[PDB]
Amino acid sequence: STGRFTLPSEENFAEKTKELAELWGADAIRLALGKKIYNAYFPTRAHNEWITLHMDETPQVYLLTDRILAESDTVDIPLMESFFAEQLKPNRDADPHKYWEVVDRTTGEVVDSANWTLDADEDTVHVSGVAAWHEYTVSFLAYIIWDPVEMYNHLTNDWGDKEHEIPFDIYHPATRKFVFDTFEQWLKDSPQTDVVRFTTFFYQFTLLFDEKRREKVVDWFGCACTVSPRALDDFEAKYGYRLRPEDFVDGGAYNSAWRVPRKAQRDWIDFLSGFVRENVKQLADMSHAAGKEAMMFLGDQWIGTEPYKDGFDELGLDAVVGSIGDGTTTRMIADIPGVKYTEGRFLPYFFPDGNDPSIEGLDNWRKARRAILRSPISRMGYGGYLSLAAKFPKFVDTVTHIANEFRDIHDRTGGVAAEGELNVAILNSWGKMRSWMAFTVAHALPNKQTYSYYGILESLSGMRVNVRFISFDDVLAHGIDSDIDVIINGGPVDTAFTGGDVWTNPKLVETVRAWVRGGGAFVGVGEPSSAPRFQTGRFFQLADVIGVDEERYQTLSVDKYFPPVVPDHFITADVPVDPAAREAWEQAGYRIPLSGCGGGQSIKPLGGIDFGEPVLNTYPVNENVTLLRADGGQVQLATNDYGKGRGVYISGLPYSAANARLLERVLFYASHNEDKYAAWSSSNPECEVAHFPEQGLYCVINNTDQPQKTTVTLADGTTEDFDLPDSGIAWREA
Amino acid sequence: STGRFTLPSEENFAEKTKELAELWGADAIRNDEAVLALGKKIYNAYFPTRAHNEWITLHMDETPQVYLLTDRILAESDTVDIPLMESFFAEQLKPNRDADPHKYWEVVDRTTGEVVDSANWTLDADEDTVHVSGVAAWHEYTVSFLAYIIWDPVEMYNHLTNDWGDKEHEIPFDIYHPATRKFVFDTFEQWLKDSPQTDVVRFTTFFYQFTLLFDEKRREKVVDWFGCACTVSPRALDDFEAKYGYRLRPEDFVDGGAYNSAWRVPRKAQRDWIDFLSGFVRENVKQLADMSHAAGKEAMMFLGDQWIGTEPYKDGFDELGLDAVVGSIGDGTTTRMIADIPGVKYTEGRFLPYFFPDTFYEGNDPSIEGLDNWRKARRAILRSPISRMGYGGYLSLAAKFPKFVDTVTHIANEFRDIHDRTGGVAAEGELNVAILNSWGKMRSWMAFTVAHALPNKQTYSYYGILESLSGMRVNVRFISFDDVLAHGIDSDIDVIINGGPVDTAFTGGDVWTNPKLVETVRAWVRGGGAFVGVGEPSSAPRFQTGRFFQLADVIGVDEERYQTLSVDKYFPPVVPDHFITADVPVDPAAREAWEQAGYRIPLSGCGGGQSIKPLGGIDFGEPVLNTYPVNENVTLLRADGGQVQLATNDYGKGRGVYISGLPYSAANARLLERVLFYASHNEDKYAAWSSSNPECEVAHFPEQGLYCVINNTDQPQKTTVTLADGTTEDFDLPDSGIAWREALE
Ligand SMILES: CC(=O)N[C@@H]1[C@@H](O)[C@H](O)[C@@H](CO)O[C@@H]1O
Numbered sequence A: 001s002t003g004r005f006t007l008p009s010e011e012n013f014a015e016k017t018k019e020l021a022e023l024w025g026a027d028a029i030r031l032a033l034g035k036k037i038y039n040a041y042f043p044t045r046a047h048n049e050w051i052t053l054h055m056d057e058t059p060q061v062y063l064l065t066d067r068i069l070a071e072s073d074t075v076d077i078p079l080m081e082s083f084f085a086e087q088l089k090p091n092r093d094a095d096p097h098k099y100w101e102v103v104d105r106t107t108g109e110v111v112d113s114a115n116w117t118l119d120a121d122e123d124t125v126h127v128s129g130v131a132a133w134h135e136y137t138v139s140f141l142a143y144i145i146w147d148p149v150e151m152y153n154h155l156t157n158d159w160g161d162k163e164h165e166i167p168f169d170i171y172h173p174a175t176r177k178f179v180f181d182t183f184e185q186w187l188k189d190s191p192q193t194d195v196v197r198f199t200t201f202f203y204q205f206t207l208l209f210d211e212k213r214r215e216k217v218v219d220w221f222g223c224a225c226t227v228s229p230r231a232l233d234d235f236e237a238k239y240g241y242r243l244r245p246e247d248f249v250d251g252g253a254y255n256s257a258w259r260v261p262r263k264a265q266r267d268w269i270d271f272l273s274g275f276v277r278e279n280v281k282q283l284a285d286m287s288h289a290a291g292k293e294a295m296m297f298l299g300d301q302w303i304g305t306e307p308y309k310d311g312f313d314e315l316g317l318d319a320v321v322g323s324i325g326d327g328t329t330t331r332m333i334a335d336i337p338g339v340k341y342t343e344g345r346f347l348p349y350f351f352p353d354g355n356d357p358s359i360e361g362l363d364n365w366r367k368a369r370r371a372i373l374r375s376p377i378s379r380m381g382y383g384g385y386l387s388l389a390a391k392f393p394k395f396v397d398t399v400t401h402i403a404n405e406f407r408d409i410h411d412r413t414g415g416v417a418a419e420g421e422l423n424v425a426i427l428n429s430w431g432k433m434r435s436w437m438a439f440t441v442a443h444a445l446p447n448k449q450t451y452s453y454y455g456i457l458e459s460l461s462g463m464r465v466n467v468r469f470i471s472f473d474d475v476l477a478h479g480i481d482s483d484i485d486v487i488i489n490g491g492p493v494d495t496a497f498t499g500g501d502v503w504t505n506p507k508l509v510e511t512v513r514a515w516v517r518g519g520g521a522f523v524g525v526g527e528p529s530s531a532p533r534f535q536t537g538r539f540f541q542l543a544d545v546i547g548v549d550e551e552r553y554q555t556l557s558v559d560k561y562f563p564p565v566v567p568d569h570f571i572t573a574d575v576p577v578d579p580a581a582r583e584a585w586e587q588a589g590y591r592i593p594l595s596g597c598g599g600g601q602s603i604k605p606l607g608g609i610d611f612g613e614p615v616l617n618t619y620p621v622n623e624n625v626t627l628l629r630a631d632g633g634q635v636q637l638a639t640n641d642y643g644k645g646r647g648v649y650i651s652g653l654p655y656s657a658a659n660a661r662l663l664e665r666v667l668f669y670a671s672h673n674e675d676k677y678a679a680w681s682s683s684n685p686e687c688e689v690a691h692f693p694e695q696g697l698y699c700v701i702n703n704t705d706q707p708q709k710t711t712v713t714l715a716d717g718t719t720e721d722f723d724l725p726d727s728g729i730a731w732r733e734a
Numbered sequence B: 001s002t003g004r005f006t007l008p009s010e011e012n013f014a015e016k017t018k019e020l021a022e023l024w025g026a027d028a029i030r031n032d033e034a035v036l037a038l039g040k041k042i043y044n045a046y047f048p049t050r051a052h053n054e055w056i057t058l059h060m061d062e063t064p065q066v067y068l069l070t071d072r073i074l075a076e077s078d079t080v081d082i083p084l085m086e087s088f089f090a091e092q093l094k095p096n097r098d099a100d101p102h103k104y105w106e107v108v109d110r111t112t113g114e115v116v117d118s119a120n121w122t123l124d125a126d127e128d129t130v131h132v133s134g135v136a137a138w139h140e141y142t143v144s145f146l147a148y149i150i151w152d153p154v155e156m157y158n159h160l161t162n163d164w165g166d167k168e169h170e171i172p173f174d175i176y177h178p179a180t181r182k183f184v185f186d187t188f189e190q191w192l193k194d195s196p197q198t199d200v201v202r203f204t205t206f207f208y209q210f211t212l213l214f215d216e217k218r219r220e221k222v223v224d225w226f227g228c229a230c231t232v233s234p235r236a237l238d239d240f241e242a243k244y245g246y247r248l249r250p251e252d253f254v255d256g257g258a259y260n261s262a263w264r265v266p267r268k269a270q271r272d273w274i275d276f277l278s279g280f281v282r283e284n285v286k287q288l289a290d291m292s293h294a295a296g297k298e299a300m301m302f303l304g305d306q307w308i309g310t311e312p313y314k315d316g317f318d319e320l321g322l323d324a325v326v327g328s329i330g331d332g333t334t335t336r337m338i339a340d341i342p343g344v345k346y347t348e349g350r351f352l353p354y355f356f357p358d359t360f361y362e363g364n365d366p367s368i369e370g371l372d373n374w375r376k377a378r379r380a381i382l383r384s385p386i387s388r389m390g391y392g393g394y395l396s397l398a399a400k401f402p403k404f405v406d407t408v409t410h411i412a413n414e415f416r417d418i419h420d421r422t423g424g425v426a427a428e429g430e431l432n433v434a435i436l437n438s439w440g441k442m443r444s445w446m447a448f449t450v451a452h453a454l455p456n457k458q459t460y461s462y463y464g465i466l467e468s469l470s471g472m473r474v475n476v477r478f479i480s481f482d483d484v485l486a487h488g489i490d491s492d493i494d495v496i497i498n499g500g501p502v503d504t505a506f507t508g509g510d511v512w513t514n515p516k517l518v519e520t521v522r523a524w525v526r527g528g529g530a531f532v533g534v535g536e537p538s539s540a541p542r543f544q545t546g547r548f549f550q551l552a553d554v555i556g557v558d559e560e561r562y563q564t565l566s567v568d569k570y571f572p573p574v575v576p577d578h579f580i581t582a583d584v585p586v587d588p589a590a591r592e593a594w595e596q597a598g599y600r601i602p603l604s605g606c607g608g609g610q611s612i613k614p615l616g617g618i619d620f621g622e623p624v625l626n627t628y629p630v631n632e633n634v635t636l637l638r639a640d641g642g643q644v645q646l647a648t649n650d651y652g653k654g655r656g657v658y659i660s661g662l663p664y665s666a667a668n669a670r671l672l673e674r675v676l677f678y679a680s681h682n683e684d685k686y687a688a689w690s691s692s693n694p695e696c697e698v699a700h701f702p703e704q705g706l707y708c709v710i711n712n713t714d715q716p717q718k719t720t721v722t723l724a725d726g727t728t729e730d731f732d733l734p735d736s737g738i739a740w741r742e743a744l745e
């Protein structure tokens, strides 16, 4: 129809915005047009005139120095040598001996404050009475004198000499009053503004730069940049113990979300969230009283908001808007409960950095569309310079097609989600609060270390099943909900995502085993249920369930015997064959048992599947485990029957259409639901089907810019053939 | 010349043995009428703990025993039944029902690690099954039980391997029991009388078999060439308790399923058991050697089979009075295992191939393997001489292969020639290198071994370190963390190597959390020492969130353990041309593609500086995932695939080097050699007594006034040798060849 679209604007372009709004069925702009007007609002910056007179009220952060080697009983530790001095400055106002910590990293012990001094004229700490040949660090408070995101944009775009925006912390009453008074006045001064687009609120996700103007530390969920002597003293009075600098710097980990969460972290999250939420409610209330909608950007200063924790609905936010990078980041936005609507800001950004922009635009659409069919988002839009995009007529036509397809989905489905064929729960330390947020370091930027696991979320994001996120605490307190078909546990050992020492809790192991034994399904990816040193002979504590353990060089005396790999199986049914590869694998056969080397490992790989980063020396726990891929003398893919249920091991799973199909088949197989797989399935992995039963229709989508041929199988057993063009979509009667 | 060579023979073969003996210059014959006539030193094999079923069938409670661990059985209620034998070879092993199971066995909840009270379990009278009650559902349970070993493990190996079918199984016996001990000594006394023709008693071996347990499918289940699983008994355990003041648990042997692998960080209970056992084994070996000497015979020990408790590298071995050790020559490392043994009068290598139909069959060319085995041992022998060589098996098989027979002639002649030219002295070593680990000298040349001479996927990246060193022109010693903590680092050491995966004897485990070890190594490197770390050196889990390799500061590299993903990693540009990599073959097409693709630009949460395409050119074996340089002043020499394989770092006066892994090859041995000279700031000493071509090596004998150059391959090799005075000589060495030249005396 028309609507559900946010068109960005600029000056001296009033005429073409009218044409592009008319062409794109836009109902919002970021004046006489009758459009909803969005205004970005930046609560903690844009007022150097305030903060320069109150410089002790900028946000602060605990910073950890480089490790400095003592070569006798004294050592000097430079504070600022590894940090960007334009962004960060040591706090000399708050008593260093009270607020800072010098640590001997070699022993883990805190150096007595009587044994170190801060230099009067240099940013350097002198430590005396120390042990030679140990490494020492300082953890110190630092003011953030440049708003991290503004700084990133400055550096990236090369804003040269432009004045640096100094950020402020509303935890201080003088600054808080300033902010609310300013917003009050701003509202009165902006009668044209229909939506306050808060970008964002009060605390920046951890984002620190080094002396070379490069990113030094980043965590999209990190709350490093949220301390002050006042907050820390108040925490102590509220929680009943004092936080150490170490509770923030975390030996150099800075409380990465990959770390197994500690009590101190959760307490700090609780404390910060209570404060942030009340102030956000106040901002929402002021916006509402002025007759405007309040919308939050899912990012930047989003720390303490916790959109997936209970009570978020109480803030009365009208909307969440977020960055659509892929399916996972789409679901991050779409699944948020307790706002009236959601918006994705789509790609490409309308920005200069011959080229055909339609390609990226249609790709972004596809990456997200498959997620949207599973969990609809209310609105779409783009950001930036609308005059720049007006130049590329093929891109404009692209957008008209997308906005239409977007509205047509809504018209056909009424914004109902597609029906899900199985209930899948991802189990980790965080649970619901980090829904779709597992494995992220930097937003939308998976890397070598993370992509073998992020691929699981990415596959699931657009899959025809219902995904929920549960924690070990949920499971321990309530058991496993009776409606769950499959639990997934995945990640490296000693992370929040596998769980760490929670696996040495016999109650957890009893609950899972009993549940799988009764008909449950457990899928372990990478190093599932891992717990180091607990048992000499068992690393994955649920190795018995999935039929696979990892050799950790404690069991090399025990010969490992691999059963023959099963090349024709339901799980691998869609993996493109490759006759000459299979032939070579069959001809080379399996190792003969040899002293100290076990036996039965294939001499050549079968291949055909990309499992990402290897988990070295995985092996089957007995010869009744079904090996599906075990190339290179270790195991990538296996399945094991366990009473009435099944476990599956996957070493890793980078996203691709092939690997989403593999995981999907894993899910149906492990839950003994093979006979449920056929209904509402595409024969081609490159296409997916969304069934909308109560509207009596289904659709099939081409997940690629390729023509794709596919056969859809209906519930009634009949089949229908399709020949979808680039990014296509066909609708049928159910 | 003639001698230093042991020939095997057999019945009805006098003519051919005489002929071959003369051809190969044999001075000893290993066990006929006219052969005994030949005037050769006669060797006879002796097997103290088997070959007497007539004794042990009448005393079956005196067979050796072993603690065994059952499969993990899942309880699905508060009771659980555990079969003892389903996972084991019932022809080899049987549960000891004689010795009270409640005193000697343990049922364990593996899910909690708790021992189940013995009131809660009973051994079924009729079946090999333990019934447990009062337990927790959904936990795993196991039993650790004493089993008699009713088939000699090595005899059984040979039976199954050679398809002996119905042949009677030899039952082994345990001299710890007084009755069997008297039998064994009376029998040996008698045998000595009945054997006046025998000059050398070749004990194969002594009292306790290395851990070797088979499964219900008649396959190897558990093996440790150093393991002392097969050494217990109710009496031995009770005697140990009395002596050491504490009771060993069954767990102290089964070790949660690890069975005390030499790779496990050694526990006190393991070392106490070794001390107890070797006290007993050694007193009894001495008696055998004394009885041999009194009968006018030499006593020679096989380094293998029943060698547990002998401890050839522990102090006091010389007091046994053994005349010799003989061992299997499997490669350079296994050659050094024998060669370096102190406290015997002479040592002997049994070379390959074994004279058996698996090698000696029509269409096979055993001369290739014969000469390959010689090349591998010869490079090690130059650094540490063995006194003698020889072969085992059926001479009648070898005799049918004239090419092989002529190859042996050549080998025997060259073996004696090296001996007559060097006078049995070791080559001069250019650097003093110490391997540091939990075991030290007691396991010299024995690090990274599971089964003898069988490196595998899990071990070859570390075993290659020893194989490279075995024939390398440096002096290699093996030192323990206890040595270093007690005495510091000896002042003659140029380089310390610490190699292996985390939580093993070879890296050292939580010893690296001991500040005094870290202090001692750091101060030594800062003062001009060199530390080379391979794989996961100095690693200690959980101790520091931001530092896994404790000496990451020395070598310049740490391993990301998924605790520090918020910290962007920045890799300096790789240095393709460097002393260490100077002999790596250049591949201009790889270098061009790597140069062109360049390095990753910094990206949020992804760091920067990683090469987009691999440079390659070096086989580093098993990857160590997510290694990274700790700062940008580290020199990266190879850092392909977004992680680090090879790096060096200046650390005061000294240097650290990181290598992710090192399979043995000519190229990687050259790489390691260069690392040693470079890390010790000895680049200036490298060229003296060296071969330009990595396929050849140089051995210098200053006291004899000579050097030699050897070709380690079966292809011709040209090489330029550099002498100490900076002069050079060019050689064109034939297949497997050697050349000798005068040096200053
Ligand atoms: C959703 C979100 O927080 N996006 C931010 C973006 O605003 C910022 O410019 C960038 C800097 O690295 O980090 C993230 O991508």
Ligand SMILES: CC(=O)N[C@@H]1[C@@H](O)[C@H](O)[C@@H](CO)O[C@@H]1O
Residues within 6 Å of the ligand: A595, B154, B157, B303, B304, B305, B328, B452
């Ligand atoms: C040196 C040594 O102990 N060798 C033994 C050999 O006797 C035995 O036949 C084999 C069985 O797997 O193990 C080892 O190779």
Ligand SMILES: [Mg+2]
Residues within 6 Å of the ligand: A119, A120, A121
């Ligand atoms: Mg001064």
